């Protein structure tokens, strides 16, 4: 386990820098101020995800249309996954670490106005704690999330996409092989980690539904039409590791 594989070290090196929400924690929370900070933090993280993708081996070789499609389909999962990692890493998964300046502990969640959403997102960090996910496993898993959903008709650079996905799958195995020595144990951990990824498909639509309803509550038939493919099943093709 000593030496970390080059590709994994590369992934760590391209991890975006800390992103701040720009939230003023010296003032009492309000439903509006917290929603405002999340949207601001969200846009910043999105641009960060796009930048990150540009340094990911194999990504820029895909048709630009596939690149756009993949980011569109996975930004929510990537963000909730990163949130889970920060929460697990910095606060033992005991609270939601959206940013250094936006951390919601249990009490803060209960009074945020979106407590149910908090409990759902909290599921990821809690699972990270149980599994004790390593930084190496995390980095490989995150790339797989970016490559976990495609159009029903597939992509333009389909073969290239599949080889890119297959490579990071192999890399996840190396990551696991670092602490898991044994063919039965390493195999079992692969199932656990990838099963966790399969389970995110359902969770992600929950987040998109909450996003839409938060929008509706601020203000249509057209906006709702463009969001359904993100909350409804059968509109895209999730790539499951297990039946």
């Amino acid at each position: 386990i000593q030496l970390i594989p080059p590709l994994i070290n590369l992934l760590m090196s391209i991890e975006p820098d800390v992103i701040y929400a720009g939230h003023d924690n010296t003032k009492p929370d309000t439903s509006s101020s917290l929603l405002t900070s999340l949207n601001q933090l969200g846009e910043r993280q999105l641009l960060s995800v796009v930048k990150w993708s540009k340094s990911l081996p194999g990504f820029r070789n895909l048709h630009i249309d596939d690149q756009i499609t993949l980011i569109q389909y996975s930004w929510m999962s990537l963000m909730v996954f990163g949130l889970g990692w920060r929460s697990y890493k910095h606060v033992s998964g005991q609270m939601l670490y959206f940013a250094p300046d936006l951390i919601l502990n249990e009490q803060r969640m209960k009074e945020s106005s979106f407590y149910s959403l908090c409990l759902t997102m909290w599921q990821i960090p809690q699972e990270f704690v149980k599994l004790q996910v390593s930084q190496e496993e995390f980095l490989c898993m995150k790339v797989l999330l970016l490559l976990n959903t495609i159009p029903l008709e597939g992509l333009r650079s389909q073969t290239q996409f599949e080889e890119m996905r297959s490579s990071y799958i192999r890399e996840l195995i190396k990551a696991i092989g670092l602490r898991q020595k044994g063919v039965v144990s390493s195999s079992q951990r692969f199932y656990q980690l990838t099963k966790l990824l399969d389970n995110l498909h359902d969770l992600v639509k929950q987040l998109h539904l909450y996003c839409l309803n938060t929008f509706i509550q601020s203000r249509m038939s057209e906006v709702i039409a463009a969001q359904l493919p993100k909350i409804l099943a059968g509109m895209v093709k999730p790539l499951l590791f297990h039946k």
């Binding site: 930048k51 980011i71 569109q72 930004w75």
Partner: peptide, 13 residues
Amino acid sequence: GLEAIIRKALMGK
């Protein structure tokens, strides 16, 4: 609405 943001961000740098 993000497609526009994503598309523009991908071309840039």
